[PDB]
RNA sequence: CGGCCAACUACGUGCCAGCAGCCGCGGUAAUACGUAGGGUCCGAGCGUUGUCCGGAAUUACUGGGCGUAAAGAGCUCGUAGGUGGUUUGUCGCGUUGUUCGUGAAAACUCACAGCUUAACUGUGGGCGUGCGGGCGAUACGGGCAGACUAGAGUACUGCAGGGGAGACUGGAAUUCCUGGUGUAGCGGUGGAAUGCGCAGAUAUCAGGAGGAACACCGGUGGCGAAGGCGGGUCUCUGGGCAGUAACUGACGCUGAGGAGCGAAAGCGUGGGGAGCGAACAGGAUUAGAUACCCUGGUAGUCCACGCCGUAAACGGUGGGUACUAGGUGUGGGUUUCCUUGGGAUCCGUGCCGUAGCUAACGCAUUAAGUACCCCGCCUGGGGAGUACGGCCGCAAGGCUAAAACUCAAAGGAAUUGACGGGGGCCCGCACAAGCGGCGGAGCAUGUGGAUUAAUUCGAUGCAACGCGAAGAACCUUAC
RNA sequence: AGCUCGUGUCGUGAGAUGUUGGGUUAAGUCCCGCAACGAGCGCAACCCUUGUCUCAUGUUGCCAGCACGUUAUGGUGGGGACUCGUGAGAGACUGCCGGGGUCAACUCGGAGGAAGGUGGGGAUGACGUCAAGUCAUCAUGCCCCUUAUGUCCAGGGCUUCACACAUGCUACAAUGGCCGGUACAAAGGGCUGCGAUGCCGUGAGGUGGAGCGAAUCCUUUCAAAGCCGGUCUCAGUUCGGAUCGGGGUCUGCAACUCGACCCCGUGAAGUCGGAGUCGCUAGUAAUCGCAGAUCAGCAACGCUGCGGUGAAUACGUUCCCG
């Protein structure tokens, strides 16, 4: 319908960096398999925690798993108790040893992934969806330094039978411009009536910064 | 040059064009011309060209005025209806084909002659300067 | 208009002066056919006013319901309208017409209550009246009966204004019962006002 | 316990069983069906059905309407009726003031008393909106008796006009006829064919007959009450307008029923019959034309004498009257000024435009504006301007005019779209200009269908069918 | 090439206006007007590749000027000159001149230049449509199975066939077939992989392992159509290869149902294809080979790419289609 390519996959050569970074000849399928099982292992407890980014640098078979989140304090509970448990399970599930770096984003409401987190987690929690979005925004519109936003919500909105898509915005979000620095995040709400897939575009600025 | 529809009733939008015109002239005293692409420089030459050639008085206004002086109530009908709508009194020149009920404090006369019209402009401009002297 | 009860840890709800009385009369989704389907928008007929007897009439167009209500609030805010009274009644029987809206607004003795249909009941409950007797003849609508009621309140005038138009010393303009009601209403204005000063 | 309309959740059946006052709820996640919890509203009751008033300004006296929504008789003349300019007098019938009589009791309303309270009952007022008698008033309506000239009508001087009827006559054109000249086609169409020709057509020239219609002037123009009216001339006759004010002195307006006029088609009797032409043939088109298009063609169209009475008889706007900014055309006529030009005026007919009005479009001194007088007419859509009955008619039919029943609408104006074998302007291998193919042959793949124990499952206009498969011997793999 | 919004105005209202008008554009591109003034998502631009040059640049790549090879060639000492490889940079902007333009946008010609006017091609799909597709990629609400609708294995099927459609490939021959000689690519692929010289076969291939995780080694120094020569003489043929028989090789536990390839024979339809219909406007069409992914093997004539040789025509919007 809207045949819109994932813009983090449309600027992954130009502005947005890769999330996983190594070099691999004849070891690549194994590094893919470990990358997948690591991201499944970091889905659940960190999606409780407020995860945004999961980068995996990979040096000579050590591993370096780095996570950008919005609360160092739920990811790091008691020191080593909440960190070294998921870290140690990453050390056992992989056949390797894990150096887990955990870091905070300076503003959670201007990460598109974290905006999709807070919006969809509100939308599972029986709030008004036009109020959620509309408050998804107002906040982020701001606050830093953030020249667009565009929120779309499809699915059983309000528990209705029809799957109505909604489309709210403010400012400038140019997708066809490649010097855009757009963050994109889709996260999917889980109501009892079903799943409300939320897409958030956030246009930070014109800046190439090449 | 041309009466833009909605200057008085809509001041909150046409004031933004003025601050953009200030940022344009303040980036003309800056001197950034060669560092940008010349299509953007000629485009800002069109923005300063049209926006300065068509907007000269509200450059000094800023302040949603208390009185409006109108030449030719017939042709500039938009200014007289907008000026009536806010409650601002209307001072005008009225030929034989102008409705005097829309103008509170008129000065009747021909507007087609540059001597007569321009002389009445001298009347009320000297009147405003006479207001400025004792203030 | 749902999910309004909320507590926010944000900057401000911006509650401030002019706590006026605001009534939303009707909302009908307004559709528009375009190429490939229908575009639903929303109209909210907003009545605002204070209990002195100043009335607004606003008409909100937006594709969200509280957005249309807020735009009707700002539009009636832009356009107020003074209604003359006697005590908390109306002066004299009028009929207003807004092109099909007929409304008869007749005064009554106090204590009777605002008897009117829901649009006229809205415009008169926001206003400074407490005891009048209206009826909405014709047009069976909300917009035309609100706008017809406001035209009916434009056909109102003071007893004093009438005396002034005719250059006659009051007494000589009213009859006497209504002058006595002026004495009653200004007397209770004096009692509640001087209880307001202390 | 959807919405109105105070009051919601689960289970059970999933276009069934049922619900419902209307809108409408039931197609395996119903707050609308059935049961449960729970809530709401009433309470010795609470729901249903029926009948009436209300809401219904929806028969509108108070208190509605008629350009297009239902609704202005086709148009006039006029009987009863309704309505009436200016002014003096008189009567006191309408109107009004006041007093008397009466409007039984009960009820109703106000106060009070009585029953433990209340309903209930009683006492005393008011109500009894009216009617009759006496006395008073005279502005307004009316009656009578008068007076007036602005409305109305008449006389006089002009003026414009397809107003009407009768009579006589004019030319161009079409058709036929006789006679020339003269040959093989003419006619007709989107393209053709029936058709007329080769026996002398069409073509052209001369003459003759006969009928009808009036080119140009001639149009947003004139006249008529409305239909309607244009070759000319003559005869008879109708209305209008202006000017003077000579006369009469309110004689005005409207008008239920009523009489008269009333396009076209049609009808009767008698004429006439060129062109056009229903019906009626043939031809063609087409699936099929009982149609459009073609060739022929009778009633009719024409005149005389009568019928009939209908129309988008339309300005979709009843008639009269007074008033309410203007601007510009054109038709008829009077006058002041420049000296035909301009002004002013009375009557007419158009275009634009304020105020005001209207649902909107629009109207807007030629009102759909502001008011008065009289008439017609409307009361949801169908059923139906139909039946029954009567009246008129030679007939066709017209006029007058229902009910059962049924529907939850049928309508008016404007808005956004889509659409058009509407208009304009544009583009694309869209056509044209080319080149190479597919459709026929053999095979390779995929699908339909039929098979099968199984032929796993998906994808069927463009946008499914060398597609999910970037690899079916076993594995894959679902059968 | 459009789709909207904010604020103002217009309207009782749905709504309008803006976004219509005059001109211009590949384009709501852009100017000039106009009760509108602005913004936003699109269009354009930013990015990749192709076209020219400059600077940097020397092995595994080039070889001019040098030296040495003799057999076989940059083969080897050597060299930055030419390529080429990949980094940075310049360069196309109606910038420069002539004419139309309302002295505005823009359009017709000229110069310079490798390139001229979005140079060529990509990547890039606005608001929405179609209850389009997919509960079999995955995720999933609800309903169903739980002694089977789970799961394990052998065998079979997904390949059946009187048919009908659809996309392709090989053809119907002389611009051709067959034999001999000979010249020129681009890109790619490679670990329990790619596998050379040599030897055994007619040939698939066998034996063997040089050498390479690869600008080096291997895919032969890479092609085929091309060119030179000979033969065939218009024919159901020296065209055409379907089919069928015999004989093999390789992969795999296993080629029966059901693999590909080679050898010998066999030698059918088919003589340019009815109505209809499809693709394509320049390195395009047409034709010629090459590589890749999937893969032990292959139904590959498929798909994705790479290069070779290379045309005709466009008068122009009447007609069909959007």
Curated annotation (Swiss-Prot), chain A:
Is Ribonucleoprotein a UniProt keyword of this protein?
Answer: yes
Highest taxon, organism lineage? Bacteria
Q: Does the keyword Transmembrane helix apply?
A: no
> Which residue intervals define the domain KH type-2 in the entry?
38-106
UniProt record, GO biological process: translation
**GO terms of molecular function:** mRNA binding; rRNA binding; structural constituent of ribosome
A GO cellular component annotation in the UniProt record: cytosolic small ribosomal subunit
Alphabetical keyword list: Ribonucleoprotein, Ribosomal protein, RNA-binding, rRNA-binding
Q: Give any extra note attached to this record.
A: Binds 2-aminothiazole antibiotics, which are antitubercular agents.
Primary role: Binds the lower part of the 30S subunit head. Binds mRNA in the 70S ribosome, positioning it for translation.
Give the record's family classification. Answer: Belongs to the universal ribosomal protein uS3 family.
What assembly does the database describe for this protein? Part of the 30S ribosomal subunit. Forms a tight complex with proteins S10 and S14.
Q: What is this protein called?
A: Small ribosomal subunit protein uS3
Species, as recorded: Mycolicibacterium smegmatis (strain ATCC 700084 / mc(2)155)
UniProtKB/Swiss-Prot annotation, chain B:
Coiled-coil segments = none
For this protein, the parts annotated as crossing the membrane are none
What family does the database annotate? Belongs to the universal ribosomal protein uS2 family.
Tell me the protein's name: Small ribosomal subunit protein uS2
Give the gene symbol: rpsB
Note the residue range shown relative to the complete protein: 94 to 228 of 277
UniProtKB/Swiss-Prot annotation, chain C:
Q: Where are the transmembrane segments?
A: none
The record places domain S5 DRBM at 20-83
Key words of the record: Ribonucleoprotein, Ribosomal protein, RNA-binding, rRNA-binding
Q: Which InterPro entries match?
A: Ribosomal_Su5_D2-typ_SF, Ribosomal_uS5, Ribosomal_uS5_bac-type, Ribosomal_uS5_C, Ribosomal_uS5_N, Ribosomal_uS5_N_CS, Ribsml_uS5_D2-typ_fold_subgr
Q: Which GO terms describe its biological process?
A: translation
Report any Pfam family annotated for this entry: Ribosomal_S5_C
Q: What GO molecular-function term can you cite, just one? A: rRNA binding
Domain of life of the source: Bacteria
- A GO-annotated cellular component: small ribosomal subunit
Instruction: Name which cysteines form disulfide bonds.
Output: none
Q: Where is the composition biased (Basic and acidic residues)?
A: 1-18
Q: How does it assemble?
A: Part of the 30S ribosomal subunit. Contacts proteins S4 and S8.
Q: What does this protein do?
A: With S4 and S12 plays an important role in translational accuracy. Located at the back of the 30S subunit body where it stabilizes the conformation of the head with respect to the body.
Domain remarks in the entry? The N-terminal domain interacts with the head of the 30S subunit; the C-terminal domain interacts with the body and contacts protein S4. The interaction surface between S4 and S5 is involved in control of translational fidelity.
| Similarity field | Belongs to the universal ribosomal protein uS5 family.
Q: Which named protein is this?
A: Small ribosomal subunit protein uS5
Instruction: Please name the source species.
Output: Mycolicibacterium smegmatis (strain ATCC 700084 / mc(2)155) (Mycobacterium smegmatis)
Which gene name belongs to this protein?
A: rpsE
């Amino acid at each position: 319908m809207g045949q819109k390519i994932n813009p983090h996959g449309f600027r992954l050569g130009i502005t947005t960096e890769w999330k996983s970074r190594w070099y691999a000849d004849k070891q690549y399928k194994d590094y893919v398999k470990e990358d997948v099982a690591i991201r499944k292992l970091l889905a659940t407890g960190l999606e409780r925690a407020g995860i945004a980014d999961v980068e995996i640098e990979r040096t000579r078979d050590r591993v370096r798993v780095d996570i950008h989140t919005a609360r160092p304090g739920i990811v790091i509970g008691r020191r080593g108790t909440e960190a070294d448990r998921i870290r140690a399970d990453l050390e056992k599930l992989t056949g390797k040893q894990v150096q887990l770096n955990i870091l905070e984003v300076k503003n959670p409401e201007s990460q598109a992934q974290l905006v999709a987190q807070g919006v969809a987690e509100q939308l599972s929690n029986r709030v008004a969806f036009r109020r959620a979005m509309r408050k998804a925004i107002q906040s982020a519109m701001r606050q830093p330094n953030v020249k667009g936003i565009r929120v779309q919500c499809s699915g059983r909105l309000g528990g209705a039978e029809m799957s109505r898509s909604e489309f709210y915005r403010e400012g400038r979000v140019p997708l066809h411009t490649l010097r855009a620095d757009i963050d994109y995040g889709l996260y999917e709400a889980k109501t009892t009536f079903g799943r409300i897939g939320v897409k958030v575009w956030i246009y930070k600025g014109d800046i190439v910064g090449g | 040059q041309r009466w833009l529809g909605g200057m008085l009733t809509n001041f909150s939008t046409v004031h933004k064009r003025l601050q953009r015109l200030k940022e344009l002239e303040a980036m003309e005293q800056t001197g950034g011309f060669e560092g940008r692409t010349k299509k953007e420089i000629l485009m800002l030459t069109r923005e300063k060209n049209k926006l300065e050639r068509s907007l000269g008085g509200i450059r000094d206004m800023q302040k949603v005025p208390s009185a409006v002086w109108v030449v030719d109530t017939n042709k500039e009908h938009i200014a007289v209806g907008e000026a009536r709508k806010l409650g601002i009194p209307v001072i005008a020149i009225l030929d034989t084909n102008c409705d005097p009920d829309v103008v509170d404090y008129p000065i009747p006369g021909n507007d087609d002659a540059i001597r007569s019209a321009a002389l009445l402009t001298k009347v009320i401009a000297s009147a405003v300067a006479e207001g400025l002297q004792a203030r | 208009r749902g999910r309004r009860d909320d507590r926010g840890g944000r900057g401000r709800d911006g509650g401030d002066k002019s706590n006026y009385i605001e009534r939303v009369v009707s909302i009908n989704r307004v559709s528009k056919v375009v190429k490939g389907g229908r575009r639903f928008s929303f109209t909210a007929l907003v009545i605002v006013g204070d209990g002195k007897g100043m009335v607004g009439v606003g008409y909100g167009k937006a594709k969200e319901v509280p957005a249309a209500i807020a735009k009707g609030v700002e539009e009636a805010r832009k356009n107020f309208f003074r209604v003359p009274l006697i005590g908390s009644t109306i002066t004299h029987p009028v009929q207003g017409e807004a092109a099909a809206g007929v409304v008869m607004l007749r005064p009554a003795s106090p204590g009777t209550g605002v008897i009117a249909g829901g649009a006229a009941r809205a415009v008169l409950e926001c206003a400074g009246v407490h005891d009048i007797l209206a009826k909405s003849l014709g047009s069976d609508n909300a917009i035309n009966v609100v706008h017809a009621t406001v035209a009916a309140l434009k056909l109102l005038q003071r007893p004093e204004e009438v005396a002034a138009r005719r250059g006659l010393p009051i007494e000589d303009v009213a009859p006497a019962g209504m002058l006595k009601a002026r004495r009653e209403s200004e007397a209770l204005a004096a009692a509640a006002a001087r209880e307001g000063s202390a």
